[PDB]
Each structure stands twice: as C-alpha cells, then as structure tokens.
Design a protein around this ligand. Structure first.
Ligand SMILES: *[C@H]1C(F)=C(CO)[C@@H](O)[C@H](O)[C@H]1O
Length: 489
C-alpha cells in the first residue's frame, strides 16, 4: 500500500476555454484564442486543427454531471479558472495618469471605489453563472483552487491576427503594461466577488508556455505566432510583473493563499558528462522565474538587481508535469535532444525504448519526483501537483501513467517535500488548443455529438486511489511502464 497524509486531496484540473463551450448559450467569441482558431489563414496553414471550441464538452451547461462524476470518483479538490473575456467582454477606458511607455509596473492602487467602478462594466450573467458552478462544486465537498488566467485574453486586450501580420499598433496582449495593469485589477475583482467560495488562488496557468509557443515555438499554432526572441523576453518580463501585481491585488481583498501554476520538464542528462547542461536548463526554464517572484531577483539590462515589489509574491507552487527533456552540453551552452520527452513520434517508443502517448510524449514518471524535490530544496514552499496526464483515447497507457505518477508524489512526500494534493489533467476530454479534440486527456471519454461522459477504466482505478487515500495493494502492479511489445513501434 502507498498511503498519503489524511489531509492530502486527489482531484482534477480544468480550463475555461478547453471545457466550457459546447452547450448552446455558452459561446464566448471575445478572446484572442477564439479569433485565432477561427482564422481562415491559420486553418489553411495547418497552424490550427479546424476544430472549434464551441463544439466542446459543455461544462458551462453540464457542470452538475461533471461534479456528480467527480464526487462518485471520490475526488476532494478542483482547480478551474474564470475566463476574463466572459466577465469584461468590452473595452475599459484607458486609465488617467498611468504612463503606457514605462517598462516597470511596481504598484496598482486598488480600493472599494476602483472595484465598485469595475462592477459597472462586469457581465453580471457570467458572474452569476460562475457563482452557480462554484456553489455546486462546493456542495460536493470539493476544496476549490481558483485560477485567474489559463491563456485566452479579451480581444480588447489582444488582437492576435494583427500581431501575427507584424502590426504592433493594436491591442498586443502581454507585450503591453496595460494588460499587466488590467490583469491586477481583474484578479482583485474576482477575489472580491468569489472569496466566500474560494479556498486558495492561482494567478496564472503556465505563463511560460503562452510566451514560449506564442513568440518562439511558432509551429505550435499558438497566438500570436510572431517569431521574436525579443518579444519572448518582453512577454516573460510583463507576466512576472502581472503576477506580483495580481498577488497584491488579491491580498488587498483576501487573507487566503495565492500561488502560481507553471509548466515543468524534468531535465535529464544524455550522458554522465551533461550534469552542468541540466543545471543551465533548470536556471533558464524554472529558477530565473521563481527567483523573480519569490526572491525578487531579476536581470534588467545586463545587471542582477532585487525589486522589492516582486520579492515574497508567492505562498505556494502549482507543479504541472507530463515528461522529461534530455539535454547535452554544447561549446556555446546546451541543447534539447529530439526522440525523448515531448519530441517523440506519436504512439511509438522514444530513443530509450519508453512508450509515447497519442501526443508523442515519453513515459517518465520519475521526472515528477525530480521536479517536486528540486522545488522543495530550493524554496521550501508547499506544492500541489496542479496538472499530470496523458493523451490516450484508448486508455491503454493511462492506468500505468496515473498510478506511476501518484507513486512518485508519495515518494516526494516521503523524502520530506510538502505536497498537499494531486490534480489529474483532466476529469474529461477537452479542446487541446491548436490540436483540437483528437488529443483526449480525460479520465472520462466525451462523446462530442451528445456531450455524454463515459468512465474509462483508468477512472475506476483513480476512484480506488481517491476513496482509499492510497495506491491500494490490488493496483500496485500499475506502478510500472506500459508493456511496449503489444503497442505500436
Ligand atoms: C497542461 C497540459 F499539459 C495540456 C496538454 O497539452 C493542456 O491541455 C493544459 O491546458 C495545460 O495547462
């Protein structure tokens, strides 16, 4: 048996854009992502699948069913976001005496009156619908992590097609301090409306992937698909500040924990000569960011300084994990290797003989122990596993994936790391961004014609885990690698 603390909670994570739409009445056409996946030219290029999110699993209407299934599955924690676009679909008037050309955003003044002024702009039907969703959630004894942001921005803050075309005269998303300013205020507003329901907060989900795939990994078909190292850096600088300002915003209205959710890889050495490459990869993809919002340490210009408005802006770390990245040392630095981690053939085997998912991601659960213990030893902040799952419509690999990753969290806790829950990605299949609906991550299969949910056998396995608070003796064999001999090579 692998028994978790009596306080540890098993549950799931879910995004607004990915799961809400699909039931008539749910449509939200006021985001960069909506416009981006409907773009005629993006569709002809193959940057997006042609699948549309309004044909989705319909959480907006069917949330009672999602929650029924979660309660039956014995789940005790949920993490979801509100969609900004839903709450403030229309442009807000530019602020008076805020200099849109200043690089730094060290304060956003928020009070009772700035909040009541916002009320005048807020979509009240959206607020009331979210309140109905969250109450039903709480009525099942589900502990509630509310996230403010999981990638789509209001169109009035980002027109991604204008930016793709090389036009920076329009709303430019995270490239603009206006977006930072409004993000702090949005976060404050949501905490002010929802803090009676909420247990813990996250500002953002994986802001590193928004900027990485948006401005460098442009084959991903992520908005705005404008290839620039420079704009990639500006995005990440503005998101650090947006996080700090959102923290202050929330803390002005709530005494509750405020964290962030971030995309992690376990960096692994190709040979025993590549350990320094692993540390350099960890500095570039992880520490640089967390040292900013925890220690206030940052590089502006070519100089290492401490910003007092950034220091101490984090109570907990949301660890999002799916696979490793293999790196080697170069003369000039380090490189990632294809044929491992996220860079594999779909439904095959990696260069190490490990099975790959429907998305071409290598099976490597020990990476999750690496990431949790490295965060713990550097910062000693408590963590949730806010995301872990696999694209696997057939359910061949998911039972092994689920039990193996849960074992590695048990291993981290046993090592001394404070990890308070495990949230699977995801309860049900959903819209996988530029890939569309083909990549199915759910414990529950979604028939998109009917919106009906079905229990994949891995859902029955997760119910064993969640209702016992343990990997039981009877399912312990699934702590192993899916046998590759019967799978595609
Ligand atoms: C985490 C994740 F891995 C997937 C799969 O690509 C996305 O669907 C989530 O939005 C992301 O947070």
């Amino acid at each position: 048996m692998y028994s978790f603390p009596n306080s540890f909670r098993f549950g799931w994570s879910q995004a607004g854009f990915q799961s809400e739409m699909g039931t008539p009445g749910s449509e939200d056409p006021n985001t960069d992502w909506y416009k981006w996946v409907h773009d005629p030219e993006n569709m002809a290029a193959g940057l997006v699948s042609g699948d549309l999110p309004e044909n989705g699993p319909g959480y907006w209407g069917n949330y009672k069913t999602f929650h029924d299934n979660a309660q039956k599955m014995g789940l005790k924690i949920a993490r979801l976001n509100v969609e900004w676009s839903r709450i403030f679909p229309n442009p807000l008037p530019r602020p008076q005496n805020f200099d849109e050309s200043k690089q730094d955003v060290t304060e956003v003044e928020i009070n009772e009156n700035e909040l009541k002024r916002l009320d005048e702009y807020a979509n009240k039907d959206a607020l009331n619908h979210y309140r109905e969703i969250f109450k039903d959630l709480k009525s099942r004894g589900l502990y509630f992590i509310l996230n403010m942001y999981h990638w789509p921005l209001p169109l009035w803050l980002h027109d991604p097609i204008r930016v793709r075309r090389g036009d920076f005269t329009g709303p430019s998303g995270w490239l603009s301090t206006r977006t930072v300013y409004e993000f702090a205020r949005f976060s404050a507003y949501i905490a002010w409306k929802f803090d009676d329901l909420v247990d813990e907060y996250s500002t953002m989900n994986e802001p590193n992937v928004v900027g990485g795939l948006g401005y460098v990994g442009v084959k991903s078909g992520f908005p705005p698909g404008y290839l620039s190292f420079e704009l990639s850096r500006r995005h990440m600088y503005n998101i650090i500040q947006a996080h700090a300002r959102a923290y202050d915003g929330i803390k002005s209205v709530s005494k509750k924990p405020v964290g962030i959710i971030y995309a992690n890889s376990s960096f692994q050495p190709l040979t025993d000569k590549d350990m320094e490459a692993v540390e350099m990869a960890e500095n570039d993809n992880r520490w640089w960011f967390f040292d900013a919002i925890i220690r206030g340490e940052i590089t502006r210009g070519n100089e290492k300084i401490v910003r007092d408005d950034l220091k101490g802006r984090l109570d907990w770390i949301g660890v999002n994990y799916y696979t490793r990245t293999v790196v080697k040392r170069t003369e000039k630095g380090y490189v990632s290797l294809g044929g491992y981690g996220h860079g594999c053939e779909r439904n095959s085997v990696s260069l190490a003989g490990l099975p790959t998912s429907d998305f071409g991601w290598e099976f490597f659960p020990e990476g999750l122990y690496d990431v949790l213990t490295k965060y713990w030893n550097r910062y000693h902040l408590y963590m949730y596993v806010t995301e872990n799952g696999i694209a696997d419509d057939a359910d061949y690999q998911r039972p092994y994936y689920l039990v193996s990753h849960v074992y590695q969290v048990h291993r981290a806790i046993n090592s001394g790391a404070d990890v308070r829950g495990y949230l699977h990605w995801s309860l049900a299949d959903n819209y996988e961004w530029a890939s569309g609906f083909s990549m199915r991550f759910g414990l529950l299969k979604v028939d998109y014609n009917t919106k009906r949910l079905y229990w994949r056998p891995s859902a029955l396995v997760y119910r064993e885990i969640a209702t016992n608070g343990a990997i039981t003796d009877e399912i312990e064999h699934l702590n192993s690698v899916p046998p590759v001999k019967p799978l595609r090579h």
